[PDB]
Assembly symmetry: C3
Homo-oligomer: 224 residues x 3
C-alpha cells in the first residue's frame, strides 16, 4: 500500500512541526551541562545558544553555500516562534513549561516530530544544492547533511558560546547518532534525486522517517 | 532649536573622524595585556590585531551579509590611513606619538570622536540592511550592531590572533559597555527607520551621539 | 634565452602536478604529530584534515572573496584524485605507498612539483582578485597569498580538526617558510600584474619557481 506514503508527503511543517524541532532542541540544550546557570547569569548567551540548536542547520548550510547567515534571521515568524519556546523552557513560572514537556509521552511525541523535521531539512538542502550545482553529488550530500544535523556539526563553536571549550570532541572524531543518521539520509536521498536508488522519493521519504523515529523512541524508552 | 541637529547631520567622517576611530582603537589595543611584546616580537600579528579593532565593524557585517571580507581591504585609502596610525602608535621614535595622544585632553577628544563614528556606522548598517532586506527589523538591528561594535564582538577571535585564548569571556556572557550601547543604538535607529519611534532621524542621531560622548568622557575622567 | 620561459609557461597542471601537490601535502600531513592515530581511530577527521591540506588554498580564497567554499567540492575529479592519494598514503597494504614515495629522490620530485603548483595558485588568485577588483593592490596580494599557502594559514583550525588546540602558534606570530615565501611571491607577481615590476610575467614566473624549488630541495637534502 503506497497509498499512505503519498498522503504523508503532503505534510506542512510551518505550524506544528517547526515548534517541535524548536522545543526538542531547546530542551536538549537546557539538559546539557551547566546550561541552567548560563540563562540565569547570561540570558543573551543562552538565547544565542538556543538559536544555534534550532537554526544550526540553516546557519551551517548558508555558510557552506556563501549565503547570508543573517538571512535565517529574516523570518521573524520562525525566530519569534523559537525564541518564545526558549523563554518558556527556562523562565516559565514554577518551571511548569519544562516539567510539562519533560513528561515521557510528550517528550516522545515532540522528539519524534523533530525527526520528521529532519527529513524535509535534508531534502531541502539537497534540492537547494541542486539549484546551485546541478548533478554535483558531493555538494548535495554536504548541504543536505548540513541542514539535517547543523547543530551537531557547529557543536564545537556552540559550546564556545556558552563558555565551554572541548577541542577533543569533534563531530568527525566520534560521530554522534543524530549526525551519522543525517549523513546516511543525505547519502540515500542524494542517490534518489540522481535516480541511482530504485524507489520513489515519497516511499523512501517515509521509510527513512519511520526508521528514524523508531530508533529515537527506542533510545528514549530504554534510557528511562 | 532643531536648527543645530541638522548642521550636525551634514558631517563627513572621511578625513578627521575615521582617523580618530582608528587611533582610539589602536591605542586601546596596545593598552591591552601583552600587546607591546606582540608588536615587537610579531609585527604581523599586532598589525592584524589592530585591523580587527579598526575595521571589525566592517568585517563582521560583511560576514553576516555574505559579503566579501576582502572588500574592506579594497579601500586602500582607509587601510593605509589606519596602518600608519598603527605604526606610529607602536614604532615611533622615543614613543612621542603615543605619549602625545595619551595626554588626557587629546585622548578625550579622540575617544569622543570615535563615538561619533559609531553612530554613522550603526546607521550605515541599518540602511545597508534595508537595501538587502526591506522591513526585516532583526536584520537591521544585527547589521547596525555589527558595524557599531564589530571589534567588540570578534574580540574572542581577535585575542586568538595575538595568542591569547579566553573561552570564558564571551561578549554574550558579560556584555561590555561599548557593545551594549551599540545594541541600544541599533534598536533605537531601527525603530526610527521603521517609524515606530516618534522622532526624526537627525534629532535621534544627535541626542544618541551626545548621550554616548558624555558617558565615555565621564568614564575617562573618573578613571584617571 | 627567453625562449625557454615561454615553453615553461605552457605547462598544464591537471594530470600530473595536481596529484603531486595532493601527495606532498597528504604525506606532510601524515608525518605530523599523532596523525597516524587519527586516521586509524577516526578516518572521517583525517580525510577532512587532508582536504584542508590540499584545497586549503581554494577554501581560504573562497571565504575571503565570499565565494561558496563548497564550490571546491564540485570538481569531483579533483576531490577524488586527492582522496585516492589520501587512502593510499595511510591505508595501503603493507604501507607500500608511503614507503615508496618517502624514498628521498621521489620525495624530492613530488615536493619539488608542489612548489610549481604553488606558483599558478598565486597568479590564479591574483588574476581572480583582479576580476573582482580592478587595481586593488592589497586584494590581489591577499587572495594570491590565500591560494599559495592556504593550508598554512588555516593551520590553527586544521589542528582543531584532528583535535589539537595550540593557541600560541599563530602564522602571524612566527611565519613559517612556505607561508613567508608565498607572501613574497604574491607581492612580486602583484607588482608584475600592476606593471610596477620591470620583468615579463613569464620570466618572473620561472625565476620565482626555480628560486622556490631550489630552496626546498636544499632543505630536504640537509635535513636527511
Amino acid at each position: 500500500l503506497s497509498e499512505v506514503s503519498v498522503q504523508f508527503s503532503q505534510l506542512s511543517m510551518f505550524p506544528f512541526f517547526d515548534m517541535a524541532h524548536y522545543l526538542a532542541s531547546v530542551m536538549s540544550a537546557r539538559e546539557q551541562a551547566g546550561a541552567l546557570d548560563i540563562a540565569s547569569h547570561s540570558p543573551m548567551a543562552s538565547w544565542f545558544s538556543a538559536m544555534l540548536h534550532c537554526f544550526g542547520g540553516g546557519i551551517l548550510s548558508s555558510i557552506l553555500l556563501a549565503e547570508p547567515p543573517v538571512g535565517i534571521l529574516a523570518n521573524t515568524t520562525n525566530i519569534m516562534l523559537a525564541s518564545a519556546i526558549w523563554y518558556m523552557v527556562y523562565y516559565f513560572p514554577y518551571d511548569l513549561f519544562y516539567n510539562c514537556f519533560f513528561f515521557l509521552p510528550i517528550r516522545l511525541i515532540a522528539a519524534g516530530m523533530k525527526e520528521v523535521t529532519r527529513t524535509w531539512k535534508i531534502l531541502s538542502g539537497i534540492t537547494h544544492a541542486h539549484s546551485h550545482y546541478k548533478d554535483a553529488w558531493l555538494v548535495m550530500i554536504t548541504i543536505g547533511w548540513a541542514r539535517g544535523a547543523g547543530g551537531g556539526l557547529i557543536s564545537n563553536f556552540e559550546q564556545l558560546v556558552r563558555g565551554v571549550w572541548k577541542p577533543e570532541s569533534n563531530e568527525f572524531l566520534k560521530m554522534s547518532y543524530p549526525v551519522k543518521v543525517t549523513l546516511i539520509g543525505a547519502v540515500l536521498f542524494t542517490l534518489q534525486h540522481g535516480h541511482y536508488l530504485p524507489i520513489s522519493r515519497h516511499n523512501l521519504m517515509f521509510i527513512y522517517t519511520m526508521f528514524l523515529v523508531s530508533i529515537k523512541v527506542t533510545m528514549m524508552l530504554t534510557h528511562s
